[PDB]
Write a protein that binds this ligand. Structure first.
Ligand SMILES: Nc1ncnc2c1ncn2[C@@H]1O[C@H](COP(=O)(O)OP(=O)(O)OP(=O)(O)OP(=O)(O)OC[C@H]2O[C@@H](n3cnc4c(N)ncnc43)[C@H](O)[C@@H]2O)[C@@H](O)[C@H]1O
Ligand SMILES: *[C@@H]1O[C@H](CO)[C@@H](O[C@@H]2O[C@H](CO)[C@@H](O)[C@H](O)[C@H]2NC(C)=O)[C@H](O)[C@H]1NC(C)=O
Ligand SMILES: *[C@@H]1O[C@H](CO)[C@@H](O[C@@H]2O[C@H](CO)[C@@H](O)[C@H](O)[C@H]2NC(C)=O)[C@H](O)[C@H]1NC(C)=O
Ligand SMILES: *[C@@H]1O[C@H](CO)[C@@H](O[C@@H]2O[C@H](CO)[C@@H](O)[C@H](O)[C@H]2NC(C)=O)[C@H](O)[C@H]1NC(C)=O
Ligand SMILES: *[C@@H]1O[C@H](CO)[C@@H](O)[C@H](O)[C@H]1NC(C)=O
Ligand SMILES: *[C@@H]1O[C@H](CO)[C@@H](O)[C@H](O)[C@H]1NC(C)=O
Ligand SMILES: [Ca+2]
Ligand SMILES: [Zn+2]
Ligand SMILES: [Zn+2]
Length: 720
């Protein structure tokens, strides 16, 4: 097989192609990029089959949360396996590999692919995989193996080939195989060592034995095989360890040490909830100038991680920097994983071979949450509810099983039509600069509406995937917004900033000028007096008035309908972004389409809040306070075209920045805004899908491109 050239070549009795999910623990993406030519079997798989540049793992980049994510399509917060070592307050039990609690089904939520196949007629076998030797939902796979780490790779392969030799009625359709290397070698001497080369060659021989075994049964061009990894590997040092003794006089708390630390009380279950979590994060925030960790309360963590909605996830969390560790007191010489999933070293491998997959294809990076839906498509079965966007992985398949469709709008735009240029209620807003006939600019004719629809909405208006959401669209010459009547603020604001000429002299925002929007009813509008009573929250502009047109154009944005509740400290970041950063991004991208708006996620479940879920409002008013603010930047991949006139692929840069009363996360004491604002926005980069879930809005529905291709853009995570 290894010396043979590149190839629906299924033998007698094989109607549907069998699926084999192969896991090579700790096989980082860099290992394939650098050492593929030293591994002849994996190199042939890389040459002949399909492979991604890398596969993104889930946070924390550990074995058990990641392996169970691959088979469920769920984030650790949903499937329950948040770590290998965890504690549940309600169960009052400790989960560990050395305990009998590993086999307890109470810890394992969701529906793994073996159960999904079993519940839909198909049979499933497993030769090691976390959860496979556990009775998840009261059921084990048809054939399984109780974990034993030292069983030779040849024996694991031989048993799998023996399972494929079984008669059609007994023979499983889905298979899982797991190997401990090159992870074990990665821990011992780091990712750049002779030990990892020996381990990479060992796993190549294992894969080679499987391919040669399949060739002997004439299944080498029949079986749909996926070769992947749970996470990557990075080098550690004992000179690169942060100690909690340097921040606390005495440690009275329990700490899950390493690259992804969690802090809780020692007195469990009695003090689990009463434990001052907010005190520990405050006691660790901005303590040292060159601090190699950042403390966080789980809802404050970047939204793209989706690591908060689970009782097993302790409120105190530490984000450790690259190649660093965080320990309780004074191993570390070698290598480890568990760090941020965006880190290059934490990136895993993904290779695919078989009749259903495209030949000699290099695909762009994707996330492990998407693998579950693909496994269902290969097995011709219906997936259980998961976090993967069904259809985003169709570009990997020759003939896609599932055809995705646009999300249907549950609420249509109504009202807010122009009637009279004079407002019925001033709403305690004042603009002494006027005299008021600038209100006629808001009265756009059919041609004027069509003109702003083409420029500011090139991919169409974001659809409202919310039932009974009373809203209206507001048209202006420089921007278009979707105003939410119940919350008295816009859900979204779309505008295409053209390529700027000179950075030297840019016009500022017109001060002390604010008026009522004549189109919006006073009862559904915000008042300027609402912000006088509140001392921590001030009014902010969603669309920046001075970004487009002249001084006359600014008046179209100096209205109550463009107002959003903002913390004085957050307003500093927001204003710096729209004044400096956004213009810089517009130069590089040859114009940029901006879609901004508020996010409400008080229960931190990653979904848009229901009115009853909002716990904070503007002092003595029903105007809700947003938890986060989204900024989705869309430009053309080909920089020769502007976002409003682009026929090809799009380039996206979404942000989900937390709306916090302090900027303690940035540690900005005596630091100018050019040193921390960009760093803070970049730290909160998310996918378009993340924004969609948090808002209940669906983007790019009017973009002339297949749904499967738009889903690739919606699941894309920009990396710098
Ligand atoms: N279904 C299943 N049921 C049960 N078990 C299953 C299983 N599937 C897989 N496993 C087991 O899972 C492991 C593979 O997972 P891993 O990829 O190693 O990661 P993990 O399980 O998420 O964390 P773990 O607790 O094991 O790592 P730790 O840092 O504490 O450290 C591990 C080792 O690395 C060393 N190490 C860690 N960090 C180091 C560093 N910075 N420098 C040097 N050595 C380091 C430690 O000394 C130690 O020897 C294997 O042990 C395997 O047998
Ligand atoms: C990830 O997918 C899961 C499953 O579809 C979502 O979790 C469900 O959420 C609903 C509503 O909150 C609950 O009633 C279910 O009990 C949850 N199921 C499980 C298995 O947890 C989850 O919200 C999705 N996450 C994101 C961020 O979209
Ligand atoms: C994995 O190990 C468990 C525990 O040793 C085995 O489960 C036992 O199986 C027998 C026969 O079905 C039952 O009578 C016992 O009650 C089970 N004990 C427990 C604690 O579950 C299981 O069969 C082993 N599986 C394999 C494939 O070896
Ligand atoms: C889970 O493991 C932790 C840590 O080993 C145990 O925590 C101890 O709990 C008692 C109170 O029950 C405290 O007085 C100790 O100080 C804790 N030890 C540490 C090291 O923090 C906990 O008891 C275990 N729970 C179960 C059910 O096994
Ligand atoms: C658990 O199994 C039952 C059938 O016994 C099924 O109805 C249910 O949907 C399963 N739940 C999960 C999460 O797999
Ligand atoms: C950009 O589009 C033009 C046609 O308008 C084409 O000639 C050019 O090759 C494209 N650039 C890239 C990088 O594909
Ligand atoms: Ca929510
Ligand atoms: Zn691992
Ligand atoms: Zn490991």
């Amino acid at each position: 097989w290894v010396t043979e050239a590149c190839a629906p070549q299924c033998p007698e009795g094989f109607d549907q192609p069998p699926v084999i999910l192969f896991s090579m623990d700790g096989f980082r993406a860099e290992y394939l990029q650098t050492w593929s030519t030293l591994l002849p079997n994996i190199n042939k798989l890389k040459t002949c089959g399909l492979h991604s540049k890398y596969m993104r793992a889930v946070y924390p980049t550990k074995a058990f949360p990641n392996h169970y994510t691959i088979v469920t399509g769920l984030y650790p917060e949903s499937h329950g396996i948040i770590d290998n070592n965890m504690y549940d307050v309600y169960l009052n039990k400790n989960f560990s590999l050395s305990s009998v609690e590993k086999s307890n089904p109470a810890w394992w939520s969701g529906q793994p692919i073996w159960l999904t196949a079993m519940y839909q007629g198909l049979k499933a076998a497993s030769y090691y995989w976390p959860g496979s030797d556990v009775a998840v939902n009261g059921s084990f796979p048809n054939i399984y193996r109780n974990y034993s780490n030292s069983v030779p790779y040849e024996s694991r392969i031989a048993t799998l080939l023996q399972w494929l030799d079984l008669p059609k009625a007994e023979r499983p359709s889905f298979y899982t195989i797991y190997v401990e290397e090159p992870d074990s070698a990665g821990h011992k001497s780091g990712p750049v060592s002779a030990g990892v080369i020996k381990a990479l060659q060992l796993v190549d021989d294992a894969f080679g034995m499987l391919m040669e075994g399949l060739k002997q049964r004439n299944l080498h061009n029949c079986v749909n095989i996926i070769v992947l990894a749970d996470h990557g590997m990075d080098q550690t040092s004992c000179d690169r360890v942060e100690y909690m003794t340097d921040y606390f006089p005495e440690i009275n708390f329990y700490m899950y040490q390493g690259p992804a630390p969690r802090i809780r009380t020692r007195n469990i279950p009695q003090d689990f909830f009463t434990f001052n979590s907010e005190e520990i994060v405050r006691d660790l925030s901005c303590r040292k100038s060159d601090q190699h960790f950042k403390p966080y309360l789980t809802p404050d963590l970047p939204k793209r991680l989706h690591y908060a909605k689970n009782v097993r996830i302790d409120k105190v969390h530490l984000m450790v920097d690259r190649q660093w560790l965080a320990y309780r007191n004074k191993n570390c010489e070698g290598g480890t994983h568990g760090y941020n999933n965006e880190f290059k070293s934490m990136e895993a491998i993904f290779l695919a071979h078989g009749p259903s997959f495209k030949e000699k294809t290099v695909i762009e990076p994707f996330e492990n949450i998407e693998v579950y839906n693909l496994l269902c498509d290969l097995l011709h079965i219906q997936p259980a509810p998961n976090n993967g966007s069904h259809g985003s992985l169709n570009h990997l398949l020759k003939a896609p099983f599932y055809q995705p469709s646009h999300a249907e709008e549950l609420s249509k735009s109504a009202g807010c039509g122009f009637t009279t240029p004079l407002p019925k209620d001033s709403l305690n807003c004042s603009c002494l600069a006027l005299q008021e006939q600038v209100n006629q600019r808001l009265n756009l004719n059919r041609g004027e509406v069509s003109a702003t629809e083409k420029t500011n909405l090139p991919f169409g208006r974001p659809r409202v995937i919310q039932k009974n959401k009373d809203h209206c669209l507001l048209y202006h010459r420089e921007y278009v917004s979707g105003f939410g009547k119940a919350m008295k603020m816009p859900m979204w604001s779309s505008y295409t900033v053209p390529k700027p000429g000179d950075t030297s002299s840019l016009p500022p925002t017109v001060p002390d000028c604010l008026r009522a929007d004549v189109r919006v009813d006073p009862s559904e509008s915000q008042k300027c007096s609402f912000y006088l009573a509140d001392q921590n929250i001030d009014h902010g502009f969603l669309y920046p008035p001075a970004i487009k047109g002249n001084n006359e154009s600014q008046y179209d944005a100096l209205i109550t309908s463009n107002l959003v509740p903002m913390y004085k400290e957050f307003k500093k970041m927001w204003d710096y972004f729209h004044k400096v950063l956004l213009i810089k991004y517009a130069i590089e991208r040859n114009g940029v389409n901006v879609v901004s708006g508020p996010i409400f996620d008080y229960n931190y479940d990653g979904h848009f809040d229901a009115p009853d879920e909002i716990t904070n409002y503007v002092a003595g008013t029903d105007v809700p306070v947003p938890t986060h603010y989204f900024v989705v930047l869309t430009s053309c991949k080909n920089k020769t075209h502007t976002p409003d006139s682009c026929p090809g692929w799009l380039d996206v840069l979404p942000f989900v920045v937390p709306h916090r009363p302090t900027n303690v996360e940035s540690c900005p004491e005596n630091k100018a805004e050019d040193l921390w604002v960009e760093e803070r926005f970049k730290a909160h980069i998310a996918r378009v899908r993340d924004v969609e879930l948090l808002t209940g809005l669906d983007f790019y529905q009017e973009k002339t491109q297949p749904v499967s291709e738009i889903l690739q853009l919606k699941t894309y995570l920009p990396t710098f």
